[PDB]
């Protein structure tokens, strides 16, 4: 999936699926 | 919204450049100039004017329609296209400066400019000369006896300040017109302000006398 | 006009109790 | 009368006008008004009735004019139908006269005959053979005759008017204006409109009944060619043609019950007319754009007549098109066009407009492909109604303020807690009247309220938005006119929606009950110009007093100035208003005394108040030299009245340390103001006594939806009610001159409102313990009041209805103890006055009942053998009037008081009342043809001792009765009302086996109201017990349905009668639902289930299919009653798709059809949840109604149906297959959301099927919030 | 032209 | 006192009509604003006078008249300042009037391209509307909350504040339109907004999380009928800053 980046509220990052 | 902006940015910029202007300001392009006027009026009403409201408070009939549409749009610059005015609240602020600049530039086309310079109150007073030129739309300049009417003179001043002048000939004709009002204190004050605005309009840098 | 006038009778006085 | 009839032959039009007016006026103010109208009508027709004799043209004009002034007084011995048809026939004769001044007088008379038809003439002119059952002439063929049997007289009348004045007989030709003058053409077009209002099919006639010669006339001409007068040169003729269109559109939509295609199809087969109802709308549209303002005013009146019926019809888009096209008239130069637009817009229901706007797509685009919405409510509210509060004409501002008040109840807004959509908003409106329950059960000034008000949230929200908008325009006001119009609007809003009741609507924030914008209104009355407009100023004072009164029960305490104010932020506002009031009342005191200006009321040193003195001095100077004594708009009196009223209001917040330094100054002002406004000055003296004596408030303090509104809330309120059915003063000498002035004024005046107030003052003075025998020196005033009864009894005292209750309250007080020198009056004498006014006078409900109400409240609540004797005499007076519901309310009181004092007296009196009431009900002698009266009777039957009703025989013998006739609505309503009153007793105070055994032992027949009995009673020609009872109720349903559907809307019944039929049917159907749904009436339920399946025993009884044909006709007009019928059909297991596919509009607009469509599906879902052992109705809902189930999935019964589908594998499979065959209509954001909320719980054995639907159809959308929800649900199904 | 009424008789008008 | 104040309102409106003739009715190129300078000095003395007379609502009326004039005359930054001075003078006594004035200041900051300033005025309004108008609001304050919600979400999608400037109120507002966890649907509506507008805002806030520009372009044409023209300008700026970011010099 995507998840929210922790360093910026508007940035999202992928996690393995 | 990016596509309305792309088409209207192109129309705005193409009419600002003298080499593109002189193509559309020509007899060969009359049907193209009429399309620009029809399309801009149509886009403006489709965005700004709700059903049951109005925008304000021989030659083919499309030519006469173009003159009326540009005259109504040049009137709308006080009201519907005045940025942040109480009647602009139906137009999104990104369309307003484009539509202003386009309308001022379309009103300078030879096709419509003579018609658009006439204060609408003089048609109501019943003036009706036979036009004659390249397009069948070249009216005379307004008789100075109408410019003794305070409202007709304010409405004339609005149109000459808004459109500017398209040639040395037109500057000299509006100069001769305004001098003819000096030869009541209120029309002297209006003519002193109008002649000041006219001569100062020569000081505009890239192209003198073109407000757009 | 009134009946006190018209029958020549004096009007009353108010007092508590 | 003979002295004025003699002048009807005069050459002078003026002498004839004086004679005609004087003659009818003398009759109108006589004692025997109906006898003198009949005598005058004898004389007037006597002057012309030998019609073969040539009469004087002057006399014809004088008599036609006198009849024209008389016919509005006949609208209601008495005038007969035969005499009234002679007026009509004589009018038709004089339209063919040579002199067209007589034709004008006859058409003007005919216009009053159709504008205000006398009821016997109205029945005659609309009936199918109604009269037959008892320069030169232009008519060139057979137009029928007035006496024909094949058609109603109005068909002939419209032909005559058309052929005389409008149509030549040749198609599309207008009659020349030299052949008939345009004044006569306008009168003739408007007489046709007034006839079409009564009988629409008169418009569809071929002009000639037998053709003219086919050589000169090759095509037949229709009457509908009069719509060619829309293009005529004269403005009044064009406008009269637009008025004809509006009346024609409205009347077709009322005479057809919005079933236009059926009604038009019948008329097209009878006449051959290709004409359409839609053909009128472009004629209204072109005439709103007329060059003449008079034509434009008339086209606006035409839209006001038809816009709402268009919006309710299958032509509802043309309704929106007309609302759009009138908005341009806001910019009109003519003030009468502006006010007609404001009156037009005030008729519109914006809930219905919001429904229509939501269904519209292409209509939002107009002629020019517009982007965005119509926003009609926002444009009407802001750009017309609130915009015209700024109008320079005060007449337009006044109309705009009134139109705004009519709009607040009709506004719709999204996200409201009471109504999530406009179909729910229209449904709750339509249910609110017909499903109203049958129920019943030191004075503070206006604008105060101590009890918790239980307000409607939707109305508080609508009011909040309106007050915010009008307050914004008041803040940003750049013009004096807009400031004035916003103050008038807020003042009137604060009257129509009182601030102390609607405190959340009036909440701007300041006290965190409310004070709204009080500081904003107080800024105006300190400003230099606003006080000098007396109208805007009196509106500011009234609004300021109302806003400061509405704080009270949260601003009251228990500092040294204004001690009762605990909210000390309000004390500046109150001191500002109070000192202002004393200054402006002192200005009036100076102006009324003529004393030149030169301490709180002192103003001689303030320039703003000296300007106000000179405005008021000028307004009073014009009054001194004029005599318009009825004029209510006189601005000095109006201003002074409002000042004294607002002072009287603010004195509820005052106590003796506020007023004690100040009272002698206020009484000095009131002494000067008293001669100009005696009544409001007396009210101020009463409040000023309540402040001195500690008797005022300052000294005497300490989610819903369609299932809910159409069924569940009415039902729950009804079932709960049936369950409950089984259970320092030295200052007094300052007031003496003003009290003596009030006493004197009572003995000189004829103003009953002054006299009523002086009695209220004396009643308050005896309660405040003033010595009456020193105030009334020798019983002079009481002697004068007793002398007034002689004139009141004989009917010589004009407005005595207003004075009676205050005299009886004053006499009742003055009787107490043996106080003062002697007892002034006794209860025995008060009983003799009351039996005097009861004996032989005018109507009880205005005279004897208002006299009883004080005496009954004293002797049974507040006041021993002499007393008990007088109480028994009052009960014998009440039993003489028991037919009136106001004395049943007095019987509820005496029963509630004897139930507490002595149970054996309560049992005896309850038997005595029931033994009188039940015979009266059996004979229709009770005045119960009203919702309030039926509710009072229902309450009396709960308050009677239950031993009074114990053997049900007397109830049954009073219920199982026929009326003397069914030819009149009043008789049918009284009869059904008595049955509904008794049926409620049987189903709440008795049990099925008690009632059914007593029915069998009394041998009642089901044939008591068979169709043969009903049919003869409509002409006026006077075996189980469960089957007997069920037939009786199921026959009454058919009677009510027939009378609601068939009876013509204004001809045969009043508007009050039409709603009471619907309320009777709502009450009846709610009883049948309690019988079949409670389980407490199991034998009656089984019998009704058998009866609904039967043939009519041949022709003897109404069948289910005949009851359904009437109920199906009600869909377009009474959707709340049709939904109760749907509920009964499911309770008797009638599940035939010949009903359900019609009401649910099953595939193979009108708002009332949508209410029934949704309500029917919801009710059917509530049924199948109780029938899950049956597969067919589960499958049928899914296969045919999947979209509607998903749209309605928030309604509790449809939610339960969807949860039942989730528990069944095959049903969940059909649900997925049905979504898969409609997913293209589900693709809209709100519908896809609802679809996925349904699919989330789908059965475990269908997980591959629903997953296949997700990836194939639902996963690929621009709506990212929904594509994420599909992804999550799809992942859960692979995990499953 | 000829008319007929109930309370009035049968009457004639000059076309 | 009140007569002197009245005369100053008329004497200010004289210069202000004179300015409107030169600027708006004649469109004079030589119209340097000597009458506007005289009108602003005249009302400066009159506001001082109404506040010494202790009647803030009558001073706020002058501030609204001058603010409206400066907006019409093409100076929205000067208008936004005078609208906030009117709001501050109204707020202790007339909360709805103050919200109306702050709404016009926010429109003026948007005309002046001062989007971070507009964002802060909408947050002040949404606080004051909950504080005086209440979790359901009364109908007049509810229409203000609905404006502030939609405007703040589009302003936050335009500006995208760092964690240092994502205030608790901004984070709390945005999370209603966002997902907390990988299997969350996103939150359900509290009934503040129409369901269709709420679903389109959630879709927009989610399309900017997953960088779906084709979805943002589709949602822009779909939301056009539902928004005010001011909000359609905000949503245009979100799609414009998405495709052609500011601050790169290109």
Author numbering:
A (entry chain C), C (entry chain D): 2 to 18
B (entry chain A): 2274 to 2330, 2353 to 2478, 2497 to 2525
D (entry chain A): 254 to 329, 349 to 406, 664 to 970, 983 to 1053, 1064 to 1109, 1125 to 1164, 1228 to 1331, 1353 to 1377, ...
E (entry chain E): 2, 4 to 17
F (entry chain B): 83 to 216, 256 to 371
Sentences from the paper on this structure:
HTT is a large 3144 amino acid protein organized into N- and C-terminal globular domains of HEAT (huntingtin, elongation factor 3, protein phosphatase 2a, and yeast kinase TOR1) repeats. HTT has been hypothesized to serve as a scaffold for protein-protein and protein-RNA interactions. HTT forms an extensive interaction interface with HAP40 which confers structural stability to HTT. We have identified and characterized macrocyclic peptide binders targeting HTT.
Informed by our crude mapping macrocycle binding sites, we determined the structures of HTT-HAP40 bound to macrocycles HHL1, HL2, and HD4 (Complex1), and of HTT-HAP40 bound to HHD3, HL2 and HD4 (Complex2). These were resolved to 2.1 Å and 2.3 Å respectively. The structures revealed that macrocycles HL2 and HD4 bind exclusively to HTT, while HHL1 and HHD3 bind at the interface of the HTT-HAP40 complex, this is consistent with the SPR, FP, and HDX data. HL2 binds a pocket in the HTT N-terminal domain. The pocket has strongly negative electrostatic potential, while HL2 is positively charged. HD4 binds a pocket that is also strongly negatively charged like the HL2-binding pocket, though the residues forming this pocket are primarily in the N-HEAT domain. As inferred from the HDX-MS data, HHD3 and HHL1 bind to the same pocket, which is at the HTT-HAP40 interface. This pocket is positively charged at the HTT interface and negatively charged at the HAP40 interface, and both HHL1 and HHD3 have a positively charged surface docking into the HAP40 interface. Notably, although HHL1 and HHD3 bind the same pocket, HHD3 consistently showed stronger performance in pulldown assays.
